[PDB]
Amino acid sequence: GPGEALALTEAARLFLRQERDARQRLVCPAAYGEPLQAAASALGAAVRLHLELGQPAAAAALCLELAAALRDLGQPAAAAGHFQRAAQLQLPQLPLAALQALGEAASCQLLARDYTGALAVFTRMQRLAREHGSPAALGAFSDVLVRCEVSRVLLLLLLQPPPAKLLPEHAQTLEKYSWEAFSSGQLPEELFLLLQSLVMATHEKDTEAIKSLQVEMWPLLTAEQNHLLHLVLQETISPSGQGV
Amino acid sequence: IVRRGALILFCDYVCQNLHDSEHLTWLIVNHIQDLISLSHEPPVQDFISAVHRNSAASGLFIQAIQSRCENLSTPTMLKKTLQCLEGIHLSQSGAVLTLYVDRLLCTPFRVLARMVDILACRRVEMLLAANLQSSMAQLPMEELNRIQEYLQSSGLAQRHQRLYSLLDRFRLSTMVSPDKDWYVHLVKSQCWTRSDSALLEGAELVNRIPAEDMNAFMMNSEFNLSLLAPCLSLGMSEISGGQKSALFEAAREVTLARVSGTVQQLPAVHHVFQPELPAEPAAYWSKLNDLFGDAALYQSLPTLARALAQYLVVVSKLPSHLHLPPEKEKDIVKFVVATLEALSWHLIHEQIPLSLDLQAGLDCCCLALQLPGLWSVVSSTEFVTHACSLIHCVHFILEAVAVQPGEQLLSPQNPKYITAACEMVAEMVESLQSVLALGHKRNSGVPAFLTPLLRNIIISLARLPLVNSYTRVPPLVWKLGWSPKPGGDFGTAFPEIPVEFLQEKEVFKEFIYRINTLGWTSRTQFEETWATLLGVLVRTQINVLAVQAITSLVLSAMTVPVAGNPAVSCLEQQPRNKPLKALDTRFGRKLSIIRGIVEQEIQAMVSKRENIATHHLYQAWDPVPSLSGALISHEKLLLQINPERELGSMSYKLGQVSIHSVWLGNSITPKHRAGVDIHSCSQFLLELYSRWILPRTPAILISEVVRSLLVVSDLFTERNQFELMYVTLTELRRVHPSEDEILAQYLVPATCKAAAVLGMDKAVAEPVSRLLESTLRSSHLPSRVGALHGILYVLECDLLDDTAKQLIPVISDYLLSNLKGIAHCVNIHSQQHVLVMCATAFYLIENYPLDVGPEFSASIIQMCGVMLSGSEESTPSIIYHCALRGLERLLLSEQLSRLDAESLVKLSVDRVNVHSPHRAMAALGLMLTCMYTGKVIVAMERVSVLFDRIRKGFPCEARVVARILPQFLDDFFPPQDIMNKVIGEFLSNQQPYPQFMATVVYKVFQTLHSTGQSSMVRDWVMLSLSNFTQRAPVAMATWSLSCFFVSASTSPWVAAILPHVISRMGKLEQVDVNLFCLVATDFYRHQIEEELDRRAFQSVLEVVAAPGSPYHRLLTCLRNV
Amino acid sequence: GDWMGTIRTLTGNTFSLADCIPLLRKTLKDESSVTCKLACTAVRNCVMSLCSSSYSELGLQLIIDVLTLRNSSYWLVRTELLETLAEIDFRLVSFLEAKAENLHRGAHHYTGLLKLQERVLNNVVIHLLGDEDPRVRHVAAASLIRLVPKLFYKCDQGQADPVVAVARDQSSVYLKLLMHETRIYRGYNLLPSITDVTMENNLSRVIAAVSHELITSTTRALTFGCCEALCLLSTAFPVCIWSLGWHCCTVGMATMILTLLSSAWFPLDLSAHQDALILAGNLLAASAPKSLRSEVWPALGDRALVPMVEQLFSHLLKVINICAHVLDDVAPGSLGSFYHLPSYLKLHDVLKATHANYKVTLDLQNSTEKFGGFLRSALDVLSQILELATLQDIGKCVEEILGYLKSCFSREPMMATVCVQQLLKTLFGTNLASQFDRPGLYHYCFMAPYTHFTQALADASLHIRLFEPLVIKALKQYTTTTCVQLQKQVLDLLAQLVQLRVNYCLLDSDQVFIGFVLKQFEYIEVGQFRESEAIIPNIFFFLVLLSYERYHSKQIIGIPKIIQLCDGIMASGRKAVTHAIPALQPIVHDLFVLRGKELETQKEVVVSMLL
Incomplete structure (x- = not known):
């Protein structure tokens, strides 16, 4: 039963160790x-066994192992x-674990x-965090919301979808970073102001302002978001x- | 806490004791900044409101902000300052406006500039609404003029035009010919600036400046150096096409001249850069504080380094006289070092340099360490301090970006900088496993646009003789008692690790990692590590490790470029499919262009850039030598690369070398590598393996030796080698019974490869079909995948059995049974299996369309049609692009009967309508091949779906479709059927990209003047009665009219200014009106001609009178004619 | 400045306090682990005073410096580091970080921020939850608990900036409002439970981080440590009170922990197993006043929880059966049956080894014993879960549960008694599910405390046959034991039996038990009862209850005799706080609130002794 699942996952773990050695540890x-492939097959068999036993969380954990x-x-x-497989397996019992898996995805x-x-994926995460995070998110969901918000603004500034193909979610986010009257949301004031300036500078084609904002925002962003901002520039x- | 709470309490006290004003005055004048910082607090809020209800208090507020705005510059502090200034008393609407425009308007933070815009606009609205005797009192005579003069001297009146218009209203209430030199002056008006706004367009502009005075234009002190890298890039596109580019040559002379110029300003004697405190060593550091310490020069080193990197990334594919001369090389090397030092200098003094400047410096370093002329310079002894500075600055930048204070980079004679560089290179080499492993738990502090640059730079620097010998030693050996005396013309040449210090598994694993990551720098080092691995081989699991290291080392020789340099080279590929004959014809030579564009974009979007270090987009190249050898250009391998490897993946696959390349390059009717005798290693391993697997050899080593043979057979050169391989593997089939577990995976494909190389006969190579069929019926797929790889080897050019053809149905039924299940599910299944299956199926359909026919080659198209239409999740992207590219080769190859061919040309319409832009671009390539191969209203459907892709695609996909559209249009059907549509698509409101459609219209119009349609163009232009001049954005109307008359011009120097017009899509400045009048007049005089048509033109303008300027000034110009 | 100036005038030496911080820094990088642990202790002694000083930059430097000690190949350094970092106020550290500009660069000119709180929380405290030494893991969990209240997070609606967070911490102590003012199990809370939103956010983030480390755990030790930490958190921040911080109530983390309990290696680690049982019970209990109805487990209504409750119930019965087989030494071969399950047979092997090791030792003060702790925790969670049971769930199960308690009583009599009390609650239907039917620095410093003060000032002007042998065993153990907690629990059980209207002549036919209880008062008054403070309130509650009872309608004890016992305890002996006052509380309550003419003079006597 579950002991067979244990045997299978502990076989897959050694298989993954051996693949890491043959590929990365000692570059070959x-x-x-x-x-x-052996680890993938073992992890798949273990996932299916766990799903049969009524344990979608253990199967999602194995999917997370394979994904990492x-x-x-x-x-x-x-x-x-x-x-995303693991996030879907976890979704309607552990929204936070699924949000972590979706952030990895x-x-x-x-x-x-x-x-x-x-x-x-960032928009799906923001949606799920709003639904399960309660304005005034819970705090474990507020981190997800801040990351997804900054990342979505950066990705929408990178892609620049045309007004025709532009979802209501994307437009509802982008109009928030236009300013007309004295609002930051879940974002810190300084970062939110820099993000508004970034949106308004990429829209008005101001390269020098975008460079200044790139330098100013470097300490405030993660390296993933620093990459997104570099790609925007x-x-x-x-x-x-x-x-x- | 006490400071802020006491200020809040004092504010609440003053709010109530408001009758007296000394405490209010004191609070304001002494703590304006604290008041602003604490303005969210209700007593301070009330205090600020009470200040707003007092003209003298409000004036003191403004006077104190004017003297404190230094620290109110932070985005948050400034936002709060604006929130406070908003409700200021009306009696001070002249003072707060003065403060707004003098201080707070020109802020690098654009949202605060907008807030200030709105608040100042209201301040003038209030001055206008308030009566005159007071509005003139608050805003004096010369103060208003100075405000307007600050707005006009700066470019601030153009970013905030409503404020300038309101100030104008307030003061009102208070009392050429298109020739060579005109074009040159117009370009100079845009390129002798310093601005990164229209680099591509400015490059397309300076390209048309005549070649006789182009090098003298790019070499003035005013030319924007930001243009050099675009000018090179554009120039490359005219050398890649086949022509000669004056743009590229002029930009190259200017780039090398500017590099030599800035290197001249360096000190003569160079000292190693060290970040600790460069003040003690010498007065050298004073000069380097003055050099790249200011901005007049620091802001030219990365701008020059971007151009130098753009040049260095294409010198591997340039004509010989366009390579950099040997005189500049030292120059370049120094420049590279200096640039990195500049960056490191900026890091020490002023925070992160710039994502672009960092990338430019690291790009220059990466690329210079890859060129032999530059490597051999920086690798020498006269440049030891420069190599040391390279190591120091790279380590410094990596730590300044990736290591937080309190953490370490790695987490569990002989100047001191030599030892420092050795240890730093070794540390950075160990960091290639965790910190600089893209997608590792420890790469999250590195922003991933520096990771490939740093990996490649670190490998290149670890190959320097100054640190190479040190780096090859594992640190687990320094932990043991090993320390010899080094000396090598530097002082750091270490003897290689003794084999007694390699019998431990950990030290051996570390040493194998070192030798595989760093490669080998010469034949001597290759032979040293070869002897070392052999002496280790001559114990529990050391033999497996030694055999794997040996096969890695011999595969290292297969890399076609720089023999064994991992930073520069990848495993050579010889694809099994051949160059298609549908191309090299009339319509195939046009499909070549139109599909090479889409291929460049698919490569930029989906390719794993394994062989590419820098960020440059159009850098795709395949490790495929001519073998008739130089590397075959990427545009000559359009659909040739093996369909089962991912796009841009360069690792080792079963099938790296086609059997045709075996029979051709080393002619084996069915010497050594680059500088290294690989024939001797070939024979040595052949003998040692043919004498090790037949006689108590454990199975776990039999498998590894057969794997190593399967891999190394890519290096065999003579027929007897493959013969010994096959005889050994057959005798091993006989000796080792059905028990394999892991042997068939490599036994079956090695057997089949060797059997195929020997001109497969029914003499000895007959019984490969038996174990092939036996291997397709297994319990684990790895053996079946090796079986499919062997099937491909044997199907390449070897008539199966030379008598019996049962093998083709044996394969085809396995294919048809195992593919049909994987169409509703592809993620749950193995990617490699699916890819090799489709590769087999496509090779069968293309090279064996005789035995295949009813069930195969028609249901395969169904497999691919159901794979291509799967959801973005259900069908991975690597399987999507494989299936699509295989379908495109099946289509372009004429080996199909015309009921699956047509069943394919109709498979392309559903796939361009996807959201994912890379799948859309792949579908667009498939569609273009369906069009050009199978060659009225169907073409109209196709051009309509193209325009829809422009209309609802991302700017990249739209720009690519717009670049390929003109060719497609003037290739498939006459201009009269599209000169409506295209114009309607340039004249629309739902069109998100008029700037691309402008070039489309221009190319169509200029291609009209091919057979004599220089009159249909003015006819379709005069069809501007309703469409043009009816565009609610009057600015967009006059812009589109100017673009249309540029596009519709037979005169030179005016057709060459389109990127100057597209550069300003809004921007209804007066120079734009003058350009519109000049261009419309040049269409009036030279083109119209008919005096009655002149009037049909003139009475289309005054319908939209617009007496202001867009059309009235034009009507005036026509009256002057 | 002034102190050092005075002392430099008096003595004359130019010693600066800024010269032992470099020595501490150097001592932390020492070669020896002994010296390293001693330097970590010194940092622990001085760091929070340095941060609150004008040398606060040096305190931040020391926090940065001690972070590298988490890699030590010496457990005592790692635990010293954990205890050092637990003392740090990260609202103050956040203030200092926000003020620092060149300290974020440190050495080597780092671009980016220190992010000390995230590094301490994730790279040290939660990372050492994965330590291979259980002692380091336990210290890490304790430090996590201490850290939760003082971990400033940004964009919190309670504290916008760290200055306001520090001001909150200061003001909550000294400006604490000077005011004042049927037995559910430890896990339930049938009240609004108005919690602090800032602490809610902190607990949410900490639980999210620990649950993420637990879900993606590739190590046995990390799983064990995360389970122990989550159990500790559910103890110190109960899921019923802090329901928002525990996600939600909790359907998911409960089924996650239950999956852990259905693993193959996890239940064989006894400590982690009991931590998991406690956590799962607490999570399933925190869903009471939202998931209860006024089939199986019919009082639940929320049916996503019924499988979890059933699984936990059956598992608890199986492991209590295993403990009963290990205690009543019987080799394994109808709801706690485990003979046909291999994982539970392995658990039986483990528990049998632990108890056979216990049977040959004499350490009666050994509290950390594994088999006893396991049985205690399992009985604890069974008693907690029984609050949600109605008679239909348990009425056909109570027989085997009582059979198990009869054998586990000799080992853990206190928790066996607690479980018997919960079973009596469910039988007579008296348990839950049967009885169920912007602000910154001016708000906190002045406005909210003054508003509370002035508002207070302005308002200041207004099936029983099956329980007989276990009850008999409990009474005899009371008459023979010296464990005061067991005697306290037996008195609770007897009080409950009396309130359930169970006859006293049925249990005490000879009046032997109250004879012993009153004979205990001799030693209690003399001061020769070792811990009588624990037993006195329960004794007087039981006696007050027995005064209402009727021995064939002839008074059993009587309120006058109880009052005389109380005043004998009072006028003869020592502290009234531990002895006389807790004795007067039951009398005062059950005489003035719950209660023709002699009652008046009894009340008079009580008022006189109260005076």
Whole structure:
């Protein structure tokens, strides 16, 4: 029963150790990686056993193990897939665990440079945090909300979706960073003011202001969000799609 | 707490004792900043409100803010200051406006500039509403003029135009020819600035300046150096196309000249940069505080480094005379070092430098350490201090970005800077596993645009002779009792680790990591590590490790560029599919262009950039040598690379080398590597393996040796080597019975590869079908995947059995049975299995369309059609792009009967309508191939879906569709059927990107003048009765009219100013009106001609009279003609 | 400044207090772990005083310096570091960080911020929850509990900036309002429970971090430590009171912990197993006044919880059965049956080993004993869960539960008695589920305390046959034991039996028990009862209850005799606080509130002794 699940997960863990050794620990530019497939098969069997026993949380934990291993080995997209698998397995009993898994999936999508996928996961996270986080979120959900908000603003400034294809969620967020009258939300005042200035500077095509804001916002953002802001500045100065 | 609470209490006391004003005056004048900081507190709120109800108190408030705005510059402090100034008493509407415009308007924080705009706008509205005798009193005569003069001298009247208009209202109440030199002056009006606003457009502009005076234009002290990297980039696109670019050559001379110029300002003797405190060593540091210490020069080093990196990233693919000369190389090296030092200097004095400047410096370092001319310089002994400064600055930047105070980078003669650099390079090399592993638990402090740069720089620096010998030693060996005496023309050459210090598994693992990460810098080092690994081999699990290290080391020789440099090189690939014959024709040569564009964009969007270090987008290249060898350009391998490896993935796959390349390069009718005798290693491993697996060898080592053989056979050169391989593997099949567990995975594909290389016959290579069929029926997939890889090896060019053809249905039924299940579910299944299955199926359909026919090659199209249409979650992106590219090769290859071919051309319409832009771009490529291969209203549907992609796509996808549209239009059907649509798409309101459609219209109009349609263009232009001049954004109306008349012009120098017009899509300044009048007049005189048409033109303007300026000034110009 | 100036005038030496901080820093980087632990102790002694001083930058530097000690290959350094970091006020550290500008760079000119609170909370305290030494894990959990109240988070609606948080901490002590003013189990709270929103946010973030480390735990030790920490938090911040901080009530973390309990290695670690049982019971109890109805477990209504409650109930019965087999030494071979389950058979092996080791030792003051602690915790959670049971759930189960208690009573008689009391509550239907039917620095410093003060000043002008052998065993153990907590619990059980209207002649036919209880008063008054302070209130409650009772309608004890016992305790002996006052409380309550003419003179006597 559960002892077979234990045997399987502890086999998969050693398999993942061996793949990490053969690939990263001792770099081998001659291996495509066999123990990763063995670990994937073992983890899948363990997940299915746990789902049969009525334990979606243990199966989601195994999916998280596999996803972290996949992201380690330089496979961000498959990692994001498995992270979202775990988040769905956890969702209607552990919203916070699912929000953590979805944040991992969004980080993995940003690693894979899948910016629309990361934007979609960030919006799903903000939605779920608003539904389960209670204006005045609980505080464990307020962290998720702050991260998803900053990341969504940065990703919408990077992508710049056209007004035609622009969801009501995206527009409702973007209009919040336009200013007309004396509001920060779950965001600290300084960061929120810098984000409003960033939105208004990328809209009015002010490169010098964007550079000043890039330097000012560096300590306030995570390195993931510093990457997003660097991409915004670079897409402003050197747009993608021109071929030169 | 006491300070703030006591101020709050005193404010609440003054709120109530308001009759006396000395405490109020004292509070204001002495604690204005505390009042503003605490303004959210109700007593302070009430105090500020009471200040607002007192003209003298409000004046004291403003006088105190004017003397304290220094610290009210912080975004929060300034927002609070504005919240306080908002309700200021009306009797001070002249003072607070003065403060607004003099101090608070020009803030780098744009939201506060907007707040100030609104509040000042209201202050003038109030001055206007209040009567005259007071409005003139608060705002004096010359004060209003000085406010307007500050707004106009600065560019502030243009960002805040409503404020300028309100001030104008208040004062009112209170009392050329389009020739070469005009174009040159107009360009100079935009490129002799210092602005990063329109770099691409400015590059397209300076490109048209004549070649005879282009190098003298980019070399003045006014030319924006921010343009050099675009000008190179654009210039590259005209050398990549095949022509000669004067833009690229001029920008290159200017870039190298400016690099030499700024290097000249460096001190003569160079000292190592050390961040501790560079003041003690010499007065050198005074000069380097004056050099890149100001901004006039520091703000030119990364701007020059961006240009230098743009140049250095393409010198690997340039004509020979466009490589950098040997005289500049030292220059360049010094520049690179200096740039990094500048960055490190900025880090020490003024916080993070700039995401762009950092990237530019690290790009220059990365790229310079990859060029041989520059490596050989910085690797020498005269440049030891420069290499030491490189190591010091890289370590410094990595710690300043990634290590918090209180943490360490790694978390569990002989000047001291030599030892420091050795230990720092070793530490950074160990950091490549955790801190600089993209997607590792410890890469979260690094922003991921520095991680590939830092990995590549660190490998390159760890290969320097100054630190290489030290770095190759594991630290677990320093923990033991090993310390010899080094000396190597530097003082740091260490003897390699003795094998007694390698018998432990941990030290050996660390040493293997070192040698695999760093590679080998020469044949000598390769031979040293070869002898070391052999002497380790000659114990529990050390043999597996040694065999894997040996095969890694020999695969290191396969990398086509810089023999064994991981930073520069990747494993050479020889794809099994061949160059398609549908191209190299008339319509195939146009599909080549239109699809190469989409391919560049798909590469920029989905490719894992494993062989690419810097950020530069259009850097894709494949490790495929000509073999007829230089590397084959990426645009000649359009649909050639093996369909089962991910886009941009460069690791080792079963199938790296095609059997055709075996039979061709080393002619084996069915010497050594780059500088290293790989034939001797080939024979040595062949003998040692053919004498190790047949005679108590444990299975866990049999598997590893067969794996190593399967890998190394990519290096075999002669037929007898493959013969020995096959005989050994057959005798091993006989010796080792059905018990494999892990042997079939490598036994079956090694057997099949060797059998295929030997011109497969029914003589000895007959019984491969038996174990092939036996292997497709297994319990674990790895063996079946190796079986499919062997199937591909054997299907390449080897007539199966030379008699019996049962193998093709044996394969095809496995394919058709195992693929059909994986279409409603692809994530739960293995990616590698699906990819090799589709690769097999596509190779069968293309090279064996005789045995396949009813069930295969038609249901496979169904597998792919149901995979391509799966949800973005259900179908991963690597499987999507594999299936799409395989379908595109099946389509472009004519090996299909025309009921699955057509069943494919109709598979493309559903896939452009997806949200994910990279899947959309892949679908667009598939659609373009369906169009160009199978070649009226269907083409109209296609052009309409193209315009819809422009209309509802992200700016990248839209820009790409707009770049490919003109060719597509003038390729598939005549201009009269589209010159309506395209114009309607440039003249619309739902169009999010008129600036792309402007270039589309321009290209269509200028391509009209091909066969003699230089008159249809003025006819379609005169069709501006209703469409044009009816555009509620009058600014957008005159902009689109100017763009349309630029596009519709037969005169040079006026058709060349379109990027100057597209650069200002709004911006209805007066120079824009003058440009519109000049351009419309140049269309009036030269084009119209018919005197009655002149009047049909003139009486289309005054319908929208607009006597202000957009059309009245034009009507005046036409009257002057 | 002034103190050092005075002392430098008097003595003459130019010693600066800013010269032992460099020595502490150097001593922390020492080669020896003994010296390292001693320097950590010195930092613990001085760091919070330094941060509150004009040398606060040096205190922040010392906090930065001690962080590297979490890697020590010596447990006592790690525990000293944990105890040092638990003393730090992170509202003050946040204030100092917000003021610092060149200290965020530290050495090597770091770009970015110190983020000391996040580093201390996640890289040290929660990281050392994964330590392989159980002692370090326990210290880390204790330090987490101490840290929760003083961890300033930004954009909190209670404290906008850290200055306001510090001001709150100061004002809550000295400006504490000078005012004043049917037995549910420890886990339930049928009240609004108005909690502090700032502490709610802190507890929410801490629980989220610990639950994340528990869900993604790839290590046995990390799982054990996170479970112990979450159990500690549910003790110090009860899920019933702090319902918002525990997510929600709690459907998810309860099923997560229950999955842990259905693992294959986790229940074999006795300490982590009992921590998990306590946590799961607490979480399932915190859902009472939102998930109760006024089928199986019919009083629940919220049916997402019924499977969790059923699973926990059956598991508790199985492990109490295992403990009963280990105590009544019987090898394994109808609801707590475990003979046909391998995981519970392995648990039986473990508990049998622990108890066989216990059977051959004589350490009666050993409190941390594993088998006794496990049985105590399991009985505790059974008693907590029984509050939600109605008779339908338990009426066909009570027989085997009582059989188990009869054998586990010899080992843990206090908790066996508690569980018998809960079973009597559920039988007679007296348990729960049967008886169920902007502000900153001016608000906190002056306005809210003054408003409370003036408002107070202005308002200042207005199936029983199955319980017989366990009850008999409890009474005999009372007559023979010296454990005061067991005697307190037996008196609670007897009081409950009397209030349930169970006849006293049924239990005390010879009046032997009250004979012994009154004979105890001799030693209580003489001062020869070792801990009588614990037993006296319960004795007097029981006697007051027995005064209402009728021995064949002839008074059993009587209020006058109780009053004489009380005044004999009072006028003869020592402190009235521990002895006389707690004896007068039951009499005062059950005489003035709950109560023709001799009652008046009894009240007169009580008022006289109160005076």
